[PDB]
Design a protein around this ligand. Structure first.
Ligand SMILES: C[C@@H](O)[C@@H](C(=O)O)[C@@H]1NC(C(=O)O)=C([C@H]2CCCO2)S1
Length: 268
């Protein structure tokens, strides 16, 4: 608990200035050191579930060979607001792997709902998370309803600690087979939506894979990431925020600042 106490006061000041709640968990995978602040509280997942969704698809592909290259055709009624990739392939279809990359790297909502259907819905994704030992994660709704971020509502939430623990298992641990694990890392490394969050907190030479979430209400936004300091063991971390009023705005700068404090607490 020593490293957590080191940054406890700076985290409290950061969330006071933000006007809401910040939850952070960070793990140095070399030393095992951790930093926690509200790490066991529930926060809305928002779009960040899409990373775990892609991992669940990769897990299924270990059993169903050829799943990733399966073509998926869809109609205009499958389009959801903010579907920047899948709308460009409406007239052609996309493969499961392309939908997964679009969900991870562009937060594509039509792709996410199509993949949720392939997994058996929100309960199917929740079941995958249970299968890797995550008892906290719950997905309950589809896009876009899952973004309501209602104060006190446990639907479509997890905790920063559970997010970090699951991310570690999937990117660095044994929850996925080696080829699928590297594909998951590669998709996260290619994310385009996180340049102002955890990525803004790390040195330019560090490799980073991340997935963001932005609910659009209640100051609710987040980011989780695996980061590789050059020549050293990776760090896994999650930063989640929420705020009391529906009209409260989220802040990418606060997410980046919290990531910096977590890394400073860990000693890097
Ligand atoms: C409902 C949507 O507003 C939201 C979502 O699909 O979940 C988008 N995703 C996120 C994210 O943080 O992943 C925002 C980013 C993505 C691209 C620029 O804003 S908006």
């Amino acid at each position: 608990h020593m490293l957590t106490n080191l940054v406890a006061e700076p985290f409290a000041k950061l969330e006071q200035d933000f006007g809401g709640s910040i939850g952070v968990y960070a793990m140095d995978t070399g030393s095992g050191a951790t930093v926690s602040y509200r790490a066991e509280e529930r926060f809305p997942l928002c779009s960040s579930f899409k990373g775990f969704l892609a991992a669940a698809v990769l897990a299924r592909s270990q059993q169903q060979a050829g799943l990733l290259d399966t073509p998926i055709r869809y109609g205009k009624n499958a389009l959801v607001p903010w579907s920047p990739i899948s709308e460009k392939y409406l007239t052609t279809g996309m493969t499961v792997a392309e939908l997964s990359a679009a969900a991870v790297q562009y937060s594509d909502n039509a792709a996410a709902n199509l993949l949720l259907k392939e997994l058996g819905g929100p309960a199917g994704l929740t079941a995958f998370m249970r299968s890797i030992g995550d008892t906290t994660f719950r997905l309950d709704r589809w896009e876009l309803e899952l973004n309501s971020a209602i104060p006190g509502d446990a639907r479509d939430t997890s905790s920063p600690r559970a997010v970090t623990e699951s991310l570690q298992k999937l990117t660095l641990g044994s929850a996925l087979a080696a080829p699928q694990r590297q594909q998951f890392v590669d998709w996260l490394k290619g994310n385009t939506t996180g340049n102002h969050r955890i990525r803004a907190a790390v040195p330019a030479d560090w490799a980073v894979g991340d997935k963001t979430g932005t609910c659009g209400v209640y100051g609710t936004a987040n980011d989780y990431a695996v980061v590789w300091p050059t020549g050293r063991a990776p760090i896994v971390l999650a930063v989640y925020t929420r705020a009391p009023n529906k009209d409260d705005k989220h802040s990418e700068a606060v997410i980046a600042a919290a990531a910096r404090l977590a890394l400073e607490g860990l000693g890097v």
